[PDB]
Amino acid sequence: MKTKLKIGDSVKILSGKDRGRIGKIASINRKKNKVIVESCNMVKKVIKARTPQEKGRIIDKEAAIDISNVMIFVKGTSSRLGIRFENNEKIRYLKKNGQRI
Amino acid sequence: MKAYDIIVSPMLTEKTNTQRESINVYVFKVNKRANKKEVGAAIKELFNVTPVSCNLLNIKSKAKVVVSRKGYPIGKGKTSSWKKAYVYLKKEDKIDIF
Amino acid sequence: ARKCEITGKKTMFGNNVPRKGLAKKKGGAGQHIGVKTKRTFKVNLINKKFFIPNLGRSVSIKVSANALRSISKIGLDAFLKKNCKKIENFL
């Protein structure tokens, strides 16, 4: 559902296998409330991709992490996000310090 | 109903292909609300040729049995019924779009 | 129905009550009610003809003897007016 994170941001992973590893948000599945972080939660998968019999193979790809497990991380700081109204623009700022994202 | 809501799409089947090759007959899926006269008029307007005659059929809906997520019959579903048209042209006439 | 076309009287449903014994006001020890059954009291409609000189013709109405008595007492036009009906609704 509604969330304050934008595709392309840089986030720090709060919990899971990848403590504190920092990656960019590649995609957001808001039907399941999950997020895909580039080069994080990285799983091995098998694909035949089709029934005809040339070959199948093992590839590596990221799995969707829950939204709650990431947090925006900008200029060496990670914090919650509030939003402000100035210049007729719903902008976003860091609750810890309060800067332009 | 304009002549575009009448003709739905042609049919490319082995039977229709041989019939078209041999006796110059074209088969269409048409709307269920059409009849002989406006099917002929629609053919004329669309392809600029007047058909000698037209024959229409009502194809009944094919029933299927629906099974659960596990899989076992829980009801009877059905396809959509439709109407098929055989169109007869003069031996010199042709339709090119096919 | 068995309905006075003027007043609206209709049949009235009630009981049928047999009684055995002798009433105390006749020296008897009393009366006892027997088996009550269902019954109906019927209006006595009359298919009467009233000749109206006002249009020189007779109109036939279903009225009860009570309504006939009242018409004889007050006059047909006034009675119809009182029961808010008009002669042209008949015919």
């Binding site: - | 575009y4 003709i7 739905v8 799409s9 042609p10 490319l12 669309l46 779009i97 | -």
Partner: protein, 65 residues
Amino acid sequence: MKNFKNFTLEDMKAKRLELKKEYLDLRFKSVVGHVENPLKKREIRRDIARLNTMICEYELGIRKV
């Protein structure tokens, strides 16, 4: 969703006719067997519906030229 939000009534009528051409031809090619963009059918159908409302609004006078 294509942009006709400035067209006049008869221009919209002409657009509707040639779009119905497009839809019929698209159905025919789909049955003949290979059409690269099947969803073009849905797009064209929605366009035609848009035209029908917009014309209707012209006769009804809700949208004035």
